[PDB]
Design a protein around this ligand. Structure first.
Ligand SMILES: Cc1ccc2nc[nH]c2c1
Ligand SMILES: Cc1ccc2nc[nH]c2c1
Lengths: 346, 346
């Protein structure tokens, strides 16, 4: 694991200099394509991309798991929805499935801790039948967290071998916005009330209780903010852990990952805390309608491309952003050159 | 023309009610897909769409023309760039071309007033060789404006006959951000300085002069804000006029149009002033990096989906947003249903 972390490659500045120059010569006023240019320069620096902005195959990894905290009444969705939806992920009827297909990406459903029988068709990396209720103790053990990080990481980089060049990350776990909020609060030093949202339509009345849960989780566990794994194991979740795993895996493989929503921002913070080297591989998608979103993105120093007021999860925002990445590539590769048109701009 | 305006159909509320209900039953917490849902409900109400959110063929109309105001030193790009780029539009090497292809849309280059010889391959609807310099008089005559509105309008709805269901609008005209700013200032009642931008990289020193030009244009012409055609003819342009034309055409045809940037917002204001019935057909794309953007969108009451810091024009932002529209459709049509999974949410 430390090995893994050790080997995360830094970006290729040489590739980035060549990209920039090229982009500057395209048929447009310099800098006119704004974020599209920056994006392209960012991809170019990703070692696994071969010195240029490009997109081969695409995949969205969906980490599924249940949470003990569901019993604290923080979620209106019935527990079994995790297991149900997970199965749906197999039939292509879910939102992430629909959007991935539209983007030509492949969805990978991973079971990291669903509280149900195993689902045929689902990748099994099950840690247990739901994680511990963070309200009265840790979600899991440190060893448990590390091992999953390792396993998901590997799975991730291995796909790289089969031609995947772009990952999208997502989750599925009833009541997951709770642990997500606790993480945010902890890494960010933000009070709970400031980052606790409605999740999957929690009624306004029920909020107060959700905030108390978060605070409790924290007081009880005393997670160390300077220790991302510590945080994850204590007030996180199997699914949060898996997401971070993808992030570490793609980074090690030198490839880009598209974040999703608030849950993903949560995992991102943890990943960045664990290995800052991860940062440059990360790519925001949309701006989640979850209350704690601005705080979280600020700490990440990220500005999403899309403003859709989405809050479904599953990696749906991720899938939605993929075309944007392809855009930047197309731009880089297919546009004509100023010089070639005898056009001179000051 | 008044006929045309007369016949713009109102949206279909019955279709919209059925869409909403359907969306509410999909495999997700209600309202979770946010703006994606709203978008879909909006399409459903468009008569030319056949009571459902759908996308057949796609086209981006690019209105090209030169401006007399270029001689006021408001633009660093050489005049001939309009003619050059227009020709490039024919070879598929431009930014809009690259992005449209990525979206599977077809680009239509229309010459409405380029100051050059005719370009083979370019649709000719040339009013003249550049419009009048708004700084010392009107850009054109009212009759000239009306006729073009008519002609572009028709061209537009006619494409509808060949299976086009989604339009994207764009322009090409060196120095066009000037007339665009004047329009904004006029419809919005905003002072010039507040809405005048750097355009295609105008140096910071040169700004002051750009603002004076705008003010002059206004003082001299005295365009009536309550009369969109009046405004267009006076301090607008052939290209601004054409854009508005597309808008009126698609609306009459009962179809959706994706806006582009600041120039497009300009034309939009004019269209809405001319026929409010147009509004509901309009669909924002991105949030232009041009200074006058927020003011303009506020008056339009629109919130772009994309934040890319783009400022190239050509309808590039429009093309970029097309997949989003397809997303909403896919969502509507391909997602599974809650009931079907025996899932009950409060
Ligand atoms: C090169 C160049 C300059 C200005 C432009 N405006 C739209 N496309 C452009 C291309
Ligand atoms: C039905 C349902 C409820 C919660 C969800 N979170 C992600 N997908 C979901 C689907």
């Amino acid at each position: 694991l430390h090995a893994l972390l050790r080997d995360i490659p830094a970006p290729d500045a040489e590739a980035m200099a060549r990209t920039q120059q090229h982009i500057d010569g395209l048929l447009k006023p310099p800098g006119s394509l704004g974020r599209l240019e920056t994006l392209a320069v960012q991809l170019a620096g990703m070692p696994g991309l071969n010195g240029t902005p490009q997109v081969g195959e695409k995949a969205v990894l969906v980490m599924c798991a249940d949470h003990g905290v569901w019993d604290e009444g923080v979620a209106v969705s019935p527990k079994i929805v995790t297991a149900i939806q997970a199965a749906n992920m197999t039939r292509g009827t879910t939102g992430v499935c629909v959007l991935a297909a539209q983007a030509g990406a492949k969805v990978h459903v991973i079971d990291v801790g669903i509280d149900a029988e195993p689902i045929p068709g689902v990748v099994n990396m099950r840690v247990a039948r739901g994680c511990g209720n963070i309200a009265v103790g840790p979600a899991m053990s440190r060893l448990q967290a590390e091992a999953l990080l390792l396993e998901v990481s590997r799975y991730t980089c291995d796909l790289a071998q089969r031609g995947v060049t772009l990952f999208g990350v997502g989750e599925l776990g009833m009541a997951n916005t709770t642990p997500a909020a606790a993480m945010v609060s902890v890494f960010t030093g933000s009070d709970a009330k400031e980052v606790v949202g409605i999740g999957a339509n929690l009624p306004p009345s029920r909020i107060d209780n959700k905030v108390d849960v978060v605070r409790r989780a924290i007081a009880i566990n005393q997670p160390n903010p300077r220790d991302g794994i510590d945080v994850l194991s204590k007030v996180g979740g199997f699914d949060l852990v898996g997401m971070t795993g993808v992030m570490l895996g793609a980074a090690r493989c030198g490839l880009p990952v598209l974040l999703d929503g608030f849950l993903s921002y949560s995992a991102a913070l943890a990943a960045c805390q664990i290995a800052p080297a991860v940062r440059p591989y990360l790519i925001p998608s949309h701006f989640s309608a979850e209350k704690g979103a601005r705080i979280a993105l600020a700490h990440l120093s990220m500005e999403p491309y899309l403003h859709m007021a989405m809050r479904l999860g599953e990696g749906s925002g991720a899938a939605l952003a993929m075309p944007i990445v392809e855009a930047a590539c197309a731009m880089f590769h297919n546009m004509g050159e100023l010089a070639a048109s005898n056009i001179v701009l000051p």
